[PDB]
Design an enzyme around this catalytic site. Sequence first.
Site, PDB file in Angstrom:
ATOM      1  CG  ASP A 181      -2.390  -0.706   0.974  1.00  0.00           C
ATOM      2  OD1 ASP A 181      -2.463  -1.287  -0.074  1.00  0.00           O
ATOM      3  OD2 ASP A 181      -3.178  -0.448   1.797  1.00  0.00           O
ATOM      4  CB  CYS A 215      -0.330   0.358 -11.616  1.00  0.00           C
ATOM      5  SG  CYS A 215       0.395   1.877 -12.394  1.00  0.00           S
ATOM      6  NE  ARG A 221       1.886  -0.093  -6.778  1.00  0.00           N
ATOM      7  CZ  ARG A 221       0.614  -0.261  -6.171  1.00  0.00           C
ATOM      8  NH1 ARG A 221      -0.202  -1.415  -6.502  1.00  0.00           N
ATOM      9  NH2 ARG A 221       0.347   0.427  -5.154  1.00  0.00           N
ATOM     10  CB  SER A 222       2.389   1.005 -15.333  1.00  0.00           C
ATOM     11  OG  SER A 222       1.120   0.304 -15.127  1.00  0.00           O
ATOM     12  CD  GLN A 262       2.390   7.553 -10.002  1.00  0.00           C
ATOM     13  OE1 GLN A 262       2.191   6.394  -9.382  1.00  0.00           O
ATOM     14  NE2 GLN A 262       1.529   8.613  -9.660  1.00  0.00           N
TER      15      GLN A 262
END
Length: 282
Positions: A181, A215, A221-222, A262
């Site tokens: 998370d 994602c 994450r992608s 990110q």
Amino acid sequence: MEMEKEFEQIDKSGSWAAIYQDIRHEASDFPSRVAKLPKNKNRNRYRDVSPFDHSRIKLHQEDNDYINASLIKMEEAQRSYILTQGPLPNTVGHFWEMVWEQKSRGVVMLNRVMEKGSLKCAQYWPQKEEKEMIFEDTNLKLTLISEDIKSYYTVRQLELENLTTQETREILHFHYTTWPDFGVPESPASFLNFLFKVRESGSLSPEHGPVVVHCSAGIGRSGTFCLADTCLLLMDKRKDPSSVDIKKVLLEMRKFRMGLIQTADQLRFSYLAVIEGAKFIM
Ligand SMILES: N#C[C@@H]1COc2ccccc2C1=O
């Protein structure tokens, strides 16, 4: 400069934040006019994440051709990826239309439907064999065929039927279920394992359409997934495994979709994944 040495130099100096901001500063800026049309407002999950017009995937319909998805084409590595957002309640039919039209074999999902107590994407695939899904807006039917649940990921066999022509295809759903998370995994072992199972499937290979990766926003994450794949592929191709510059690969990829990677922790994790991937056996 060997990236493993660059890595220790950044880590000892604690300059991850400063490297990351240099990338943000040099990154490409292209127009996203179609994404910002008023008719497309409910087709976008996040107001600050849009596909560039030059690289966007177009749906094959005259009505409205728009989806929040980009084609990342890596010329020297000879790999293509589609990066997209987690589907919304009103874009689940568009998502499966894209999978059909682009001839993709695999869907890679790097998020859970619920994270931090909020919905990060729609429940867009069937959970029981005998309860199939029909997308009436795009005339597609989706059936769960089989499910293989492991500790770090689940693999599903799906059947997608074009109700217009009664053609069917097998789609593999690769669902990475254990990204935390907050932050990034402590070790890249399970991510790299998952990465080498998508490859083995044939989903990343030139005899199929590009893999669909997502994602929640389709950049973080992608981003990590396609940066690590491309960097390891270049290290098997280049004579000098030491000539692969991860920062330069990331800026090339950011010509095709904004915001890939990110945070400074996602940048550090990407380095760790590539190096280890180059360790392991490589
Ligand atoms: N095939 C294969 C594997 C499987 O998982 C890995 C994890 C870390 C580094 C390399 C690999 C591979 O090449």
